[PDB]
Amino acid sequence: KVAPLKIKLGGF
Amino acid sequence: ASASYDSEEEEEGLPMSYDEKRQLSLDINRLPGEKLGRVVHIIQSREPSLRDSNPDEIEIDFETLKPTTLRELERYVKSCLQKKQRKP
């Protein structure tokens, strides 16, 4: 379980 | 007859390396929410998928994003992270 290069701000 | 090995200056047209993209994510987290607001809009400009969600959440995918957007994110973050310390 690894996500690609992304980023969330705050929540998911 | 022979490729000249073009070295370009296409900001919005250059392929960004995974390393660059990695830094981008770091540089964005280096920005406070006040400044994050702009980078969010920069993405939304191309990404209507972010707009689809709540602007409270930033939606970035450094893979399917185009140089036009990616570099614009960079361009902004880097302008903010120039810092009076790095450049006195």
UniProtKB/Swiss-Prot annotation, chain B:
Domain spans labelled NET: 6-88
Tissue: Ubiquitous.
Organism domain of life: Eukaryota
Record localization: Nucleus; Chromosome
Signal peptide range: none
Disulfide pattern: none
Phosphoserine: residues bearing it: 7
Stated family: Belongs to the BET family.
Domain notes: The Bromo domains specifically recognize and bind acetylated histones. The NET domain recognizes and binds the 'KIKL' motif found in chromatin proteins.
Subunit structure: Interacts (via bromo domain 1) with GATA1 acetylated at 'Lys-312' and 'Lys-315'. Interacts (via bromo domain 1) with GATA2 acetylated on lysine residues. Interacts (via NET domain) with CHD4 (via KIKL motif). Interacts (via NET domain) with SMARCA4 (via KIKL motif). Interacts (via NET domain) with NSD3 (via KIKL motif).
Record function comment: Chromatin reader that recognizes and binds acetylated histones, thereby controlling gene expression and remodeling chromatin structures. Recruits transcription factors and coactivators to target gene sites, and activates RNA polymerase II machinery for transcriptional elongation. In vitro, binds acetylated lysine residues on the N-terminus of histone H2A, H2B, H3 and H4.
Disease: A chromosomal aberration involving BRD3 is found in a rare, aggressive, and lethal carcinoma arising in midline organs of young people. Translocation t(15;9)(q14;q34) with NUTM1 which produces a BRD3-NUTM1 fusion protein.
Record-given protein name: Bromodomain-containing protein 3
Gene: BRD3
Boundaries of the shown chain within the full protein: 557 to 644 of 726
